[PDB]
């Protein structure tokens with residue numbers, strides 16, 4: 044009926060199956076965690092600034108954003124409103140990302156973000 048039908052073949056989909064992310068704790072500011080690509084639409088029309096979209100996240104975590112590098116290439120950037128601390132406890136969170144083109148294409152995916160403990164500098168507060 045529909046499930047048997049290859050619905051994916053006759054529709055546009057993102058390049059690089061989603062989705063994983065991993066950075067060395069919150070040590071690097073504004074450093075991309077992972078990059079994802081989108082298949083070129085037949086229309087190939089340009090998209091407005093702020094490529095769609097972050098719909099949800101697994102709490103408690105605030106330090107991520109979407110960076111549209113160009114055309115159909117983008118990556119998630121770390122260190123936003125607040126920084127992430129390993130000592131807090133949580134090390135992984137899933138981000139529900141919604142993707143929409145100008146033509147009206149749609150796709151929802153989950154992006155896991157991992158936090159890795161980073162060693163403090165040899166010099167610092169005594």
Ligand SMILES: [Ca+2]
Nearest residue numbers: 129130160161
């Ligand atoms: Ca740590």
Ligand SMILES: [Ca+2]
Nearest residue numbers: 068129130161
């Ligand atoms: Ca630390």
Ligand SMILES: [Ca+2]
Nearest residue numbers: 160161162163
């Ligand atoms: Ca450490």
